[PDB]
Amino acid sequence: LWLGLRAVLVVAGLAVLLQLIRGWLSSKSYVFNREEIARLAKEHSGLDYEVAFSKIIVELRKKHPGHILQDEDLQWVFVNAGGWMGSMCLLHASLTEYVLLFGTAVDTGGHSGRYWAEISDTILSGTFRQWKEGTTKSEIFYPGDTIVHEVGEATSVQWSSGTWMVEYGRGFIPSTLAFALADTIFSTQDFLTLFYTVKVYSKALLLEASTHLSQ
Amino acid sequence: ALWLGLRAVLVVAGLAVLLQLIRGWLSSKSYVFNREEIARLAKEHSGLDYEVAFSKIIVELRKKHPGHILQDEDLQWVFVNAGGWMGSMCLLHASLTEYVLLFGTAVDTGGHSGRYWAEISDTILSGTFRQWKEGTTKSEIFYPGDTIVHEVGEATSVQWSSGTWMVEYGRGFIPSTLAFALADTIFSTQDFLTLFYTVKVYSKALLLEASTHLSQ
Amino acid sequence: LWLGLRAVLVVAGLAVLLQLIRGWLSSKSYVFNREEIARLAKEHSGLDYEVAFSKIIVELRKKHPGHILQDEDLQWVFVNAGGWMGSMCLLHASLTEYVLLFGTAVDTGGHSGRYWAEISDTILSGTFRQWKEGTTKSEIFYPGDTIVHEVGEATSVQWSSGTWMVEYGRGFIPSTLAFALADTIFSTQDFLTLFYTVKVYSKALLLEASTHLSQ
Ligand SMILES: Cc1cc(OCCN2CCOCC2)nn1-c1ccc2ccccc2c1
Ligand SMILES: Cc1cc(OCCN2CCOCC2)nn1-c1ccc2ccccc2c1
Ligand SMILES: Cc1cc(OCCN2CCOCC2)nn1-c1ccc2ccccc2c1
Ligand SMILES: [Au+]
Ligand SMILES: [Au+]
Ligand SMILES: [Au+]
Ligand SMILES: [Au+]
Ligand SMILES: [Au+]
Ligand SMILES: [Au+]
């Protein structure tokens, strides 16, 4: 039973950490909320999406100081995943939550990704075709609408040029990155984009850790 | 000098013994379905709502071929990510040599058709089907009622529109084809639940065919 | 610190080879130039792109004998990369330069690929949507226009049915093929297309080697 030691240790660790992370998520005080981010995005779903980004970042830094990256640590990073290609501006990211501005200037679409996190996107501009699993028809969502991609759900997404949205995700964030960079690894091979993503995520993690240390 | 190389010689011997075995089996096997049969059955219902067409096609298939089409309890729409496109399938029948399914997409997708060891026929029930054959510079658009025969060893570029639905029948060595149907699910989407669903429906169809053979 | 010798040697080798190849490319005598290919392509920017292909191949074989493959060694090879799919006709290829006719008859788009080479594409027909990195808006280019995808640059590309262009790339060509075949490896699994690409590249390399040997 010596060769079973590795497998038993792996099973024990994975189930001890499933239980640990699941109890942590059910007893942790979160910074942001899905209704909060969706409401803030709906407040500005009218004007030019750039002005919406500006006002949303201003209100976020006012209402949650020390939790949004500084303008020095902001950059649009490409995101290739599930067969679609867009760009993101990460405003906040922790081990359990993340907030970003996502969108595309080209017509793309693919797999939404099935991960251990609840994600909410409020469309600021463009169109969002969603095709839920097990169906034969898709629905199109317009600026002002908010789509909640639940945990374990998998849909087909499609966007139009100029489609932009504010996105908030809550769950176990690392387990999701495996999907967000798969195409960057096996399709685009844009390792510099991978580096940019890791860089901005590390900056958000260090910002959150510094804010925790100050308190 | 044959110790290093023993693995390579065993691999070559096995691959050629199994190419011979499989190609002799495919040339001496009585098949269940036919390309023209499925094409006619699909074209007969190409004018109705593709959902109603699906219903009537499943009924006629279970009527004319009892014991070879899955029961309604074992049917479910499984996402399919492959060649850069994304659609969904409903597997009606599948063995080691044949498969019948209802394929289509509710979003605008397109990519590589996939080159495999099987002849595949698709009859469009609704939507549009852009096909771009290899070595050409122009593409053709196929409409409901048309039937496309993707021959063995052929590779094309496919593109679909929202609401494109079709009945598809493939004949050949089915396992060697699944490698293409799940590549994006492995390296791009990582939707392992969809991988499990695919293995599930294929195993269910294989067990149904094995049970029908055992009863006979 | 004995096993740090391997890592230090690896870094030293990679930087000595970076310096070697980069100095070579900065001092090498090239056969073609981007303005030459771009002007020749713009002269024939029309609707009947096929006649443009024929006349361009004729002019290339006239002004540079022994550097363009013969009609026997020409074939349209599928190209899957970055999430898009097109087809190519390789006219010339070496270790530092390559000239081809690229295009698609279907609607595709994805990652342009970030490689160690400057690439120039002159659109003969169709439309070319380019989305530059770090921006939120995309530009649309039409037949006659020439786009220079610079070294280290990464953009999002999108094409329409019937989009065809003449492309010339200069740099370290092998390091680019890794991107050009990634989707063929992990997405399409079209090993025959991989063989065709390797075959036409080998034919071009042997043609250029024969021309060097004759001189
Ligand atoms: C986990 C993840 C999924 C994803 O997909 C694009 C967003 N939306 C998904 C659903 O609906 C359409 C668009 N991006 N992303 C990500 C990527 C990079 C990240 C970096 C730091 C923190 C979170 C980070 C999170
Ligand atoms: C082998 C294969 C190719 C494919 O591609 C989508 C269909 N068409 C292809 C050509 O034209 C456009 C659409 N699905 N598929 C498959 C996927 C899962 C399967 C599961 C069980 C049995 C056969 C199974 C077969
Ligand atoms: C390196 C590379 C990139 C590429 O991408 C498509 C062209 N364009 C790129 C930028 O803008 C849009 C379209 N093809 N390709 C290639 C593929 C095969 C090759 C074979 C031999 C020599 C060079 C060879 C070069
Ligand atoms: Au930004
Ligand atoms: Au931003
Ligand atoms: Au079904
Ligand atoms: Au069905
Ligand atoms: Au050619
Ligand atoms: Au050609």
XYZ file of C-alpha atoms and ligand atoms in Angstrom:
727
model
C 0.000 0.000 0.000
C 3.054 2.226 -0.422
C 2.098 3.368 -3.918
C -1.328 4.294 -2.522
C 0.222 6.849 -0.181
C 0.485 9.538 -2.868
C -3.106 9.040 -4.036
C -4.499 8.965 -0.486
C -2.549 12.108 0.430
C -3.832 13.835 -2.716
C -7.458 12.896 -1.993
C -7.146 13.937 1.659
C -5.556 17.269 0.772
C -8.066 18.064 -1.961
C -11.035 17.297 0.272
C -9.551 19.094 3.285
C -9.041 22.115 1.054
C -12.463 21.889 -0.565
C -13.904 21.924 2.962
C -11.507 24.680 4.080
C -12.198 27.009 1.144
C -15.941 26.310 1.245
C -16.154 27.132 4.947
C -14.000 30.202 4.325
C -16.291 31.523 1.585
C -19.347 31.017 3.821
C -17.790 32.938 6.744
C -15.728 35.673 5.035
C -16.700 39.348 4.981
C -16.714 40.438 1.336
C -15.820 43.917 0.106
C -18.109 44.298 -2.923
C -21.543 42.986 -3.841
C -23.171 41.885 -7.088
C -26.103 44.276 -6.656
C -23.697 47.095 -5.761
C -21.578 46.695 -8.907
C -24.627 46.095 -11.114
C -26.350 49.212 -9.757
C -23.227 51.344 -10.193
C -22.947 50.144 -13.792
C -26.639 50.764 -14.495
C -26.240 54.322 -13.198
C -23.956 55.098 -16.163
C -25.264 52.720 -18.850
C -26.331 55.742 -20.926
C -23.350 57.875 -21.901
C -20.143 57.023 -23.771
C -18.744 53.833 -22.228
C -15.421 55.611 -21.631
C -17.155 58.247 -19.489
C -18.969 55.378 -17.760
C -15.633 53.703 -16.988
C -14.276 56.975 -15.592
C -17.270 57.708 -13.358
C -17.473 54.093 -12.162
C -13.790 54.035 -11.193
C -14.196 57.372 -9.392
C -17.201 56.145 -7.402
C -15.478 52.832 -6.627
C -12.356 54.542 -5.278
C -14.550 56.914 -3.257
C -16.775 54.211 -1.738
C -13.981 51.619 -1.313
C -10.620 53.282 -0.667
C -7.543 51.095 -0.737
C -9.272 48.391 -2.785
C -9.007 49.706 -6.379
C -5.663 49.827 -8.179
C -4.106 53.205 -8.862
C -4.088 54.590 -12.401
C -0.381 53.707 -12.552
C -1.307 50.021 -12.156
C -4.064 50.081 -14.808
C -3.583 48.766 -18.344
C -5.782 47.070 -20.926
C -4.695 43.422 -21.080
C -5.870 41.096 -23.838
C -7.935 38.079 -22.776
C -8.109 35.007 -25.019
C -10.335 32.229 -23.737
C -12.887 29.673 -24.879
C -12.377 30.769 -28.474
C -13.120 34.475 -27.968
C -10.810 37.478 -27.651
C -11.334 40.704 -25.717
C -9.568 43.054 -23.313
C -9.868 43.751 -19.607
C -8.986 46.514 -17.162
C -8.644 44.960 -13.703
C -9.781 47.374 -10.996
C -9.849 45.034 -7.984
C -8.888 41.416 -7.394
C -8.432 39.283 -4.286
C -8.535 35.560 -3.544
C -12.353 35.606 -3.375
C -13.527 38.634 -5.396
C -12.559 40.530 -8.516
C -13.904 43.544 -10.405
C -12.920 44.518 -13.926
C -14.037 46.316 -17.065
C -14.269 43.841 -19.941
C -15.110 44.204 -23.587
C -14.323 43.741 -27.234
C -13.858 45.980 -30.261
C -14.175 43.007 -32.652
C -16.882 40.411 -33.212
C -15.969 37.366 -31.119
C -17.654 34.587 -29.205
C -17.130 31.176 -27.702
C -17.322 29.212 -24.478
C -18.158 31.226 -21.362
C -16.173 28.847 -19.152
C -17.430 26.672 -16.287
C -15.646 27.480 -13.022
C -16.105 27.766 -9.253
C -17.278 31.375 -9.112
C -20.448 33.415 -9.587
C -19.925 36.173 -12.156
C -22.130 39.166 -12.957
C -21.771 41.349 -16.057
C -23.721 44.564 -16.646
C -23.569 45.583 -20.306
C -22.579 49.217 -20.792
C -22.556 49.103 -24.597
C -22.976 46.686 -27.470
C -24.874 43.409 -27.498
C -24.497 40.147 -25.570
C -25.832 36.915 -27.085
C -26.131 34.191 -24.433
C -26.941 30.553 -25.241
C -27.628 28.456 -22.141
C -26.644 24.791 -22.027
C -29.249 22.242 -23.082
C -31.314 24.694 -25.162
C -31.731 25.447 -28.867
C -32.337 29.226 -28.731
C -30.244 32.176 -27.561
C -31.191 35.533 -26.051
C -29.668 38.936 -26.786
C -29.005 41.386 -23.949
C -28.562 45.118 -24.385
C -27.036 47.987 -22.350
C -28.579 48.154 -18.888
C -29.139 44.398 -18.557
C -27.188 42.313 -16.035
C -26.345 38.646 -16.634
C -25.491 36.335 -13.728
C -23.324 33.420 -14.858
C -23.837 31.143 -11.868
C -21.378 28.644 -10.423
C -21.192 25.475 -12.493
C -23.134 27.075 -15.348
C -21.742 26.937 -18.889
C -23.104 29.029 -21.756
C -22.048 30.183 -25.201
C -21.322 33.914 -25.342
C -21.167 36.190 -28.368
C -20.378 39.898 -28.568
C -20.364 42.674 -31.144
C -17.735 45.299 -31.873
C -17.901 47.872 -29.125
C -19.414 45.544 -26.525
C -18.336 46.668 -23.058
C -19.442 45.677 -19.568
C -18.554 45.923 -15.886
C -17.926 42.502 -14.359
C -17.837 41.303 -10.748
C -16.900 37.753 -9.775
C -16.997 36.067 -6.370
C -15.747 32.593 -5.475
C -12.305 30.965 -5.636
C -10.534 33.243 -8.105
C -7.385 31.155 -8.837
C -9.459 28.166 -10.003
C -10.899 30.421 -12.716
C -7.602 31.676 -14.169
C -6.999 28.230 -15.679
C -9.787 29.013 -18.146
C -8.906 32.687 -18.675
C -5.428 31.834 -20.023
C -5.982 28.500 -21.818
C -6.173 30.062 -25.285
C -3.241 32.299 -24.355
C -1.238 29.102 -23.770
C -2.360 26.754 -26.545
C -3.747 29.105 -29.227
C -2.195 32.588 -29.140
C 1.031 31.737 -27.253
C 1.134 35.410 -26.223
C 3.242 34.861 -23.124
C 3.648 38.627 -22.714
C -0.134 38.872 -22.282
C 0.100 36.075 -19.705
C 2.788 38.100 -17.930
C 0.589 41.215 -18.012
C -2.309 39.261 -16.498
C -0.155 37.759 -13.737
C 1.322 41.219 -13.109
C -2.008 42.984 -12.650
C -3.368 40.132 -10.518
C -0.257 40.231 -8.320
C -0.616 44.002 -7.983
C -4.241 43.639 -6.888
C -3.304 40.896 -4.408
C -0.508 43.024 -2.943
C -2.822 46.035 -2.676
C -5.384 43.965 -0.783
C -2.685 42.495 1.478
C -1.300 45.963 2.241
C -4.779 47.234 3.102
C -5.273 44.245 5.410
C -1.916 44.940 7.077
C -2.777 48.600 7.677
C -5.919 47.503 9.546
C 20.327 -3.102 -30.984
C 16.638 -4.035 -30.862
C 16.145 -3.358 -27.142
C 15.923 0.366 -27.758
C 13.425 0.219 -30.588
C 11.503 -2.690 -29.097
C 8.784 -0.215 -28.137
C 8.802 1.314 -31.631
C 8.645 -2.094 -33.346
C 5.818 -3.207 -31.051
C 3.971 0.056 -31.756
C 4.379 -0.303 -35.533
C 3.326 -3.961 -35.402
C 0.288 -3.160 -33.264
C -0.766 -0.188 -35.380
C -0.502 -2.191 -38.586
C -2.184 -5.263 -37.086
C -5.016 -3.015 -35.955
C -5.199 -1.071 -39.205
C -5.535 -4.435 -40.962
C -8.100 -5.686 -38.425
C -10.221 -2.513 -38.459
C -10.102 -2.091 -42.244
C -11.097 -5.725 -42.732
C -13.933 -5.259 -40.246
C -15.223 -2.113 -41.974
C -15.188 -3.937 -45.333
C -17.163 -6.954 -44.034
C -19.640 -5.355 -41.599
C -23.389 -4.998 -42.072
C -24.206 -1.365 -41.310
C -27.363 -0.186 -39.569
C -27.948 3.168 -41.288
C -27.339 4.636 -44.733
C -26.291 8.093 -45.889
C -29.208 8.415 -48.327
C -31.645 7.050 -45.725
C -30.782 9.748 -43.188
C -30.612 12.389 -45.921
C -34.100 11.511 -47.197
C -35.586 11.365 -43.701
C -34.140 14.787 -42.886
C -35.125 16.397 -46.201
C -38.711 15.152 -45.793
C -39.047 17.349 -42.680
C -36.788 20.227 -43.768
C -39.727 22.625 -44.068
C -41.114 22.403 -40.556
C -39.715 24.021 -37.426
C -36.399 22.258 -36.832
C -37.637 21.249 -33.369
C -40.723 19.570 -34.864
C -38.419 18.121 -37.519
C -36.231 16.668 -34.753
C -39.282 15.140 -33.078
C -40.616 13.506 -36.242
C -37.145 12.321 -37.296
C -36.552 10.634 -33.939
C -39.974 8.977 -34.187
C -39.335 7.674 -37.708
C -35.857 6.444 -36.761
C -37.195 4.500 -33.781
C -39.996 3.119 -35.971
C -37.813 1.906 -38.842
C -34.867 0.869 -36.621
C -36.076 -0.389 -33.237
C -33.493 -1.017 -30.543
C -30.836 1.225 -32.128
C -31.911 4.746 -31.054
C -31.488 5.905 -27.458
C -34.536 6.340 -25.241
C -35.793 9.820 -24.362
C -34.397 9.429 -20.835
C -30.853 9.094 -22.238
C -31.019 12.148 -24.535
C -29.463 15.491 -23.612
C -27.978 18.401 -25.543
C -24.195 18.387 -25.086
C -22.016 21.350 -26.005
C -19.381 20.639 -28.655
C -16.269 22.806 -28.948
C -13.995 21.835 -31.818
C -11.864 23.402 -34.536
C -12.596 26.870 -33.183
C -16.393 26.594 -33.399
C -19.010 25.830 -30.765
C -22.346 24.097 -31.174
C -24.490 21.469 -29.473
C -25.381 17.882 -30.289
C -28.097 15.350 -29.501
C -26.699 11.856 -30.075
C -29.393 9.467 -31.302
C -27.239 6.443 -32.199
C -23.542 5.637 -31.920
C -21.424 2.500 -32.225
C -17.799 1.826 -33.106
C -18.560 2.310 -36.819
C -21.654 4.546 -37.132
C -23.218 7.512 -35.414
C -26.328 9.641 -35.931
C -26.930 12.963 -34.212
C -28.736 16.286 -34.406
C -26.202 19.123 -34.472
C -26.570 22.869 -34.532
C -25.844 26.213 -32.972
C -27.739 29.193 -31.567
C -24.728 31.520 -32.023
C -22.592 32.515 -35.002
C -19.578 30.174 -35.049
C -17.155 28.638 -37.494
C -13.811 26.940 -37.796
C -12.144 23.751 -38.949
C -14.468 20.947 -40.029
C -12.017 18.324 -38.799
C -10.214 15.691 -40.863
C -10.918 12.160 -39.635
C -11.285 8.556 -40.796
C -15.019 8.678 -41.490
C -17.443 9.849 -44.164
C -19.926 12.308 -42.664
C -23.190 13.607 -44.118
C -25.108 16.629 -42.830
C -28.590 17.613 -44.002
C -29.477 21.192 -43.063
C -32.880 21.541 -41.409
C -32.601 25.274 -40.722
C -30.180 28.163 -40.984
C -27.192 28.484 -43.292
C -24.000 26.446 -43.772
C -20.905 28.051 -45.321
C -18.427 25.446 -46.597
C -14.933 26.295 -47.874
C -13.174 23.318 -49.456
C -9.405 22.972 -49.178
C -7.266 24.395 -51.963
C -9.901 26.877 -53.165
C -10.473 30.616 -52.809
C -14.296 30.735 -52.728
C -16.909 29.389 -50.329
C -20.430 28.076 -50.905
C -23.532 28.621 -48.766
C -25.959 25.738 -48.281
C -29.560 26.152 -47.184
C -32.264 23.922 -45.622
C -32.795 20.763 -47.650
C -29.206 20.503 -48.902
C -26.980 17.583 -47.901
C -23.197 17.895 -47.611
C -20.940 14.831 -47.821
C -17.651 15.460 -46.002
C -15.596 12.592 -47.395
C -12.853 10.662 -45.621
C -9.594 12.604 -45.466
C -11.271 15.838 -46.586
C -10.806 19.018 -44.541
C -12.903 22.160 -45.000
C -13.731 25.392 -43.215
C -17.282 25.418 -41.826
C -19.377 28.377 -40.698
C -22.909 28.534 -39.301
C -25.548 31.128 -38.458
C -27.809 31.462 -35.437
C -30.519 28.838 -35.731
C -28.553 26.506 -38.011
C -29.627 22.920 -37.314
C -28.947 19.703 -39.194
C -29.187 15.916 -39.032
C -25.777 14.273 -39.327
C -24.727 10.689 -40.016
C -21.128 9.481 -39.847
C -19.628 6.120 -40.797
C -16.058 4.931 -40.249
C -13.951 4.376 -37.118
C -15.840 6.520 -34.622
C -13.329 6.602 -31.700
C -10.545 8.093 -33.851
C -12.907 11.003 -34.566
C -13.682 11.950 -30.958
C -10.113 13.250 -30.616
C -11.124 16.176 -32.819
C -14.558 16.710 -31.238
C -13.032 17.288 -27.771
C -9.747 19.088 -28.550
C -11.124 22.552 -27.767
C -12.893 21.122 -24.722
C -9.461 19.992 -23.482
C -7.105 22.859 -24.339
C -9.466 25.839 -24.779
C -12.705 25.585 -22.775
C -11.579 23.078 -20.109
C -15.282 22.265 -19.710
C -14.580 18.845 -18.255
C -18.252 18.392 -17.378
C -18.975 18.550 -21.111
C -16.214 15.974 -21.649
C -17.912 13.738 -19.078
C -21.277 14.255 -20.794
C -19.780 13.305 -24.165
C -18.188 10.141 -22.785
C -21.499 9.428 -21.033
C -23.691 9.593 -24.133
C -21.166 7.679 -26.233
C -20.944 4.941 -23.593
C -24.742 4.794 -23.369
C -25.062 4.377 -27.138
C -22.324 1.728 -27.169
C -24.049 -0.190 -24.364
C -27.407 0.018 -26.153
C -25.877 -1.413 -29.324
C -24.087 -4.127 -27.333
C -27.332 -5.062 -25.566
C -29.165 -5.287 -28.896
C -26.395 -7.536 -30.227
C -26.614 -9.707 -27.099
C -30.378 -10.108 -27.490
C -29.767 -11.312 -31.064
C 25.293 26.380 -5.979
C 26.259 23.629 -8.402
C 22.786 23.322 -9.905
C 22.632 27.094 -10.362
C 25.334 26.670 -12.975
C 22.777 25.084 -15.306
C 20.374 28.025 -14.956
C 23.163 30.590 -15.354
C 24.487 28.751 -18.419
C 20.963 28.672 -19.869
C 20.537 32.431 -19.398
C 23.999 33.083 -20.848
C 23.336 30.889 -23.879
C 19.941 32.439 -24.541
C 21.417 35.929 -24.395
C 24.439 35.072 -26.552
C 22.057 33.633 -29.126
C 19.720 36.603 -28.849
C 22.717 38.841 -29.563
C 23.957 36.636 -32.420
C 20.629 36.346 -34.254
C 19.690 39.980 -33.599
C 22.968 41.338 -34.955
C 22.644 39.038 -37.959
C 19.157 40.377 -38.683
C 20.329 43.970 -38.170
C 23.247 43.539 -40.608
C 21.929 40.917 -43.066
C 21.400 41.545 -46.785
C 17.742 40.820 -47.562
C 16.205 39.879 -50.908
C 12.847 41.679 -50.639
C 11.589 44.780 -48.827
C 8.169 45.720 -47.468
C 7.755 48.701 -49.811
C 8.512 46.519 -52.843
C 5.916 43.871 -51.973
C 3.410 46.514 -50.866
C 3.723 48.521 -54.093
C 3.519 45.411 -56.272
C 0.393 44.329 -54.385
C -1.193 47.788 -54.472
C -0.666 47.961 -58.247
C -3.068 45.015 -58.641
C -5.527 45.794 -55.812
C -8.741 44.869 -57.584
C -11.808 42.655 -57.438
C -10.565 39.729 -59.551
C -7.918 38.937 -56.921
C -6.958 35.731 -58.784
C -5.526 37.664 -61.739
C -3.738 39.797 -59.153
C -2.201 36.631 -57.679
C -1.045 35.465 -61.109
C 0.458 38.808 -62.139
C 2.139 39.245 -58.744
C 3.755 35.806 -58.942
C 4.923 36.585 -62.489
C 6.432 39.929 -61.452
C 8.134 38.363 -58.432
C 9.699 35.625 -60.548
C 10.793 38.266 -63.068
C 12.485 40.653 -60.642
C 13.893 37.928 -58.347
C 14.715 34.743 -60.257
C 15.607 31.705 -58.197
C 13.812 33.043 -55.110
C 10.132 32.203 -55.818
C 8.893 28.609 -55.864
C 7.818 27.109 -59.164
C 4.145 26.447 -59.872
C 4.774 22.756 -59.159
C 5.705 23.572 -55.542
C 2.679 25.817 -54.889
C -0.414 24.694 -52.993
C -3.048 26.357 -50.831
C -2.401 25.250 -47.243
C -4.879 25.836 -44.433
C -3.683 28.049 -41.577
C -5.271 27.835 -38.117
C -3.843 30.223 -35.547
C -4.913 32.549 -32.752
C -8.512 31.447 -33.203
C -8.805 32.319 -36.901
C -8.617 30.186 -40.037
C -7.395 31.090 -43.513
C -5.257 29.710 -46.342
C -1.820 30.527 -47.700
C 0.192 30.156 -50.899
C 3.892 30.324 -50.024
C 5.830 32.040 -52.814
C 9.182 32.588 -51.062
C 10.641 31.589 -47.697
C 14.109 31.569 -46.131
C 15.389 31.718 -42.551
C 14.882 35.501 -42.403
C 12.279 36.371 -45.067
C 9.058 34.955 -46.419
C 6.495 36.053 -49.005
C 3.062 34.506 -49.348
C -0.499 35.117 -50.458
C -2.827 34.849 -47.474
C -6.570 35.117 -47.190
C -9.890 33.655 -46.202
C -13.238 32.967 -47.861
C -15.013 32.692 -44.488
C -15.560 35.089 -41.600
C -12.763 34.559 -39.070
C -10.807 36.517 -36.505
C -8.594 36.172 -33.484
C -5.107 36.804 -32.170
C -2.613 38.127 -34.717
C 0.275 36.434 -32.940
C 3.214 38.136 -31.253
C 6.499 36.978 -32.762
C 10.062 38.087 -33.504
C 9.398 39.371 -37.010
C 8.032 42.438 -38.775
C 5.080 41.518 -40.986
C 3.424 43.615 -43.681
C 0.097 42.757 -45.318
C -1.344 44.663 -48.285
C -5.057 43.952 -48.676
C -5.985 42.964 -52.220
C -9.667 42.338 -51.511
C -12.167 42.267 -48.672
C -11.915 44.048 -45.338
C -9.384 43.870 -42.499
C -10.414 44.859 -38.971
C -7.409 45.585 -36.738
C -7.681 46.163 -32.977
C -4.464 47.529 -31.486
C -3.399 46.428 -28.016
C -4.240 48.698 -25.104
C -7.098 50.468 -26.920
C -10.895 50.254 -26.900
C -11.575 50.961 -30.596
C -10.722 49.143 -33.824
C -9.984 50.321 -37.361
C -11.216 48.836 -40.645
C -8.833 48.633 -43.612
C -9.802 48.191 -47.243
C -8.114 46.925 -50.451
C -4.997 48.905 -51.288
C -4.107 49.583 -47.651
C -0.990 48.081 -46.079
C -0.769 47.169 -42.391
C 2.611 46.797 -40.684
C 2.384 44.433 -37.710
C 5.619 45.421 -35.997
C 7.953 43.249 -33.936
C 6.576 42.512 -30.477
C 3.205 44.026 -31.363
C 0.001 42.079 -30.749
C -3.373 43.045 -32.214
C -6.750 41.446 -32.825
C -7.415 40.656 -36.483
C -10.764 40.074 -38.181
C -11.614 39.339 -41.814
C -14.611 39.063 -44.121
C -15.460 36.456 -46.744
C -13.170 36.985 -49.710
C -10.450 38.867 -47.828
C -7.101 38.397 -49.571
C -3.728 40.050 -49.103
C -0.053 39.732 -50.021
C 2.168 39.293 -46.982
C 5.906 39.699 -46.464
C 7.570 38.881 -43.156
C 11.137 39.573 -42.060
C 12.861 38.424 -38.878
C 13.612 34.978 -37.422
C 11.098 32.897 -39.361
C 11.188 29.562 -37.436
C 10.274 31.289 -34.153
C 7.040 32.392 -35.845
C 5.863 28.962 -37.031
C 5.227 28.005 -33.394
C 2.275 30.385 -33.475
C 1.220 29.481 -37.021
C 0.640 25.811 -36.107
C -0.594 26.053 -32.497
C -4.276 25.739 -33.403
C -3.379 22.994 -35.885
C -1.907 21.073 -32.933
C -4.348 21.733 -30.082
C -7.571 22.652 -31.942
C -7.864 21.161 -35.445
C -5.441 18.212 -35.104
C -5.063 18.422 -38.899
C -1.703 16.688 -39.108
C -1.948 16.722 -42.908
C -2.034 20.530 -42.862
C 1.008 20.477 -40.576
C 2.739 18.225 -43.110
C 1.792 20.562 -45.966
C 3.185 23.580 -44.113
C 6.449 21.811 -43.282
C 6.618 20.552 -46.882
C 6.208 23.934 -48.569
C 8.608 25.545 -46.094
C 11.167 22.808 -46.795
C 10.733 23.322 -50.539
C 11.299 27.067 -50.203
C 14.338 26.516 -47.968
C 15.855 24.078 -50.461
C 15.175 26.486 -53.335
C 16.961 29.300 -51.513
C 19.830 26.973 -50.581
C 20.183 25.888 -54.219
C 20.259 29.524 -55.335
C 22.981 30.234 -52.759
C 24.959 27.186 -53.907
C 24.754 28.265 -57.550
C 26.259 31.637 -56.581
C -11.727 34.236 -14.576
C -12.059 35.013 -15.846
C -13.074 34.685 -16.771
C -12.996 35.686 -17.765
O -13.813 35.765 -18.903
C -14.030 37.056 -19.392
C -15.044 37.775 -18.503
N -16.264 37.462 -18.686
C -16.547 36.145 -18.388
C -18.031 35.810 -18.493
O -18.742 36.593 -19.384
C -18.000 37.204 -20.381
C -16.699 37.869 -19.927
N -12.025 36.503 -17.423
N -11.473 36.103 -16.276
C -10.358 36.764 -15.605
C -9.186 37.032 -16.319
C -8.109 37.655 -15.698
C -8.193 38.011 -14.322
C -7.088 38.647 -13.684
C -7.170 38.996 -12.340
C -8.333 38.723 -11.617
C -9.412 38.103 -12.239
C -9.329 37.745 -13.617
C -10.436 37.113 -14.259
C -16.730 13.185 -34.752
C -17.509 14.494 -34.638
C -17.347 15.615 -35.478
C -18.273 16.568 -34.999
O -18.433 17.848 -35.545
C -19.694 18.443 -35.468
C -20.575 17.795 -36.535
N -20.364 18.185 -37.730
C -19.104 17.863 -38.198
C -18.882 18.217 -39.663
O -19.650 19.273 -40.120
C -20.116 20.148 -39.153
C -20.704 19.507 -37.893
N -18.908 16.028 -33.982
N -18.452 14.791 -33.773
C -18.908 13.900 -32.715
C -18.910 14.374 -31.402
C -19.328 13.555 -30.360
C -19.745 12.222 -30.631
C -20.169 11.385 -29.561
C -20.577 10.084 -29.823
C -20.568 9.596 -31.130
C -20.152 10.414 -32.175
C -19.734 11.751 -31.910
C -19.314 12.595 -32.983
C 4.256 33.233 -39.232
C 2.846 33.335 -39.810
C 1.823 34.172 -39.322
C 0.717 33.931 -40.166
O -0.528 34.556 -40.003
C -1.345 34.766 -41.115
C -0.820 35.949 -41.920
N -1.066 37.110 -41.458
C -0.459 37.365 -40.246
C -0.663 38.800 -39.767
O -1.818 39.412 -40.219
C -2.838 38.561 -40.606
C -2.416 37.379 -41.481
N 1.089 33.039 -41.062
N 2.364 32.692 -40.847
C 3.136 31.716 -41.610
C 2.596 30.441 -41.796
C 3.301 29.473 -42.502
C 4.590 29.774 -43.028
C 5.308 28.775 -43.747
C 6.565 29.064 -44.263
C 7.119 30.330 -44.073
C 6.419 31.305 -43.370
C 5.128 31.013 -42.839
C 4.398 32.012 -42.124
Au -7.016 50.267 -18.040
Au -9.912 51.219 -17.310
Au -31.565 15.755 -26.857
Au -32.941 15.750 -29.546
Au -0.998 28.032 -54.562
Au -1.007 30.990 -55.472
